[PDB]
Swiss-Prot record:
Cysteine protease that cleaves viral polyprotein and specific host proteins. It is responsible for the autocatalytic cleavage between the P1 and P2 regions, which is the first cleavage occurring in the polyprotein. Also cleaves the host translation initiation factor EIF4G1, in order to shut down the capped cellular mRNA translation. Inhibits the host nucleus-cytoplasm protein and RNA trafficking by cleaving host members of the nuclear pores. Counteracts stress granule formation probably by antagonizing its assembly or promoting its dissassembly. The active site is at H15, D33, C104. Homodimer. This is Protease 2A. Disulfide bonds: none annotated. It comes from Coxsackievirus A16 (strain G-10). The chain holds residues 869 to 1007 of 2193 of the full protein. Zn(2+) 1 binds at C50, C52, C110, H112. The lineage of its organism: Viruses, Riboviria, Orthornavirae, Pisuviricota, Pisoniviricetes. It catalyses: Selective cleavage of Tyr-|-Gly bond in the picornavirus polyprotein.
Amino acid sequence: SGAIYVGNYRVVNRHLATHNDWANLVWEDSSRDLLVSSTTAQGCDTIARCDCQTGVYYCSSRRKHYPVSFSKPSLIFVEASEYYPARYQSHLMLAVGHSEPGDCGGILRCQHGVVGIVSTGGNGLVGFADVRDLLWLDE
Ligand SMILES: Cc1cccc(NC(=O)N2CCC[C@H](C(N)=O)C2)c1
Ligand SMILES: [Zn+2]
């Protein structure tokens, strides 16, 4: 679990979004596994605007932060689940590192701020949904 709170927005994995999130929907994209909902309180997370390929992510299944080199956002095939059929998830970045399903929502950060959130994993790999291109989260 986990979310990004920036201004009046909450960013979560679309597969983990609650009834509240859907009832206060701003934007959702199944192909990215992202959903943004409106909030009443202020969010102070800073979103990174960059092309960094190194950062640190939070891994709840280990209660630890790990440094990673990750790939540029791209279309990567994702195996079927109780949330989605087999498909290409876009805006996805992979890194070598530990992850388990409950790790989704853990934040990936670089020196410039929040980069994305854990969305996929398996076989010694961890996949992050990029949020750096969503420039509207700041205005
Ligand atoms: C982080 C992690 C580790 C091991 C396994 C998983 N499950 C995973 O990748 N799935 C199921 C949940 C929805 C994901 C998706 N974005 O389509 C696909 C996650
Ligand atoms: Zn950066």
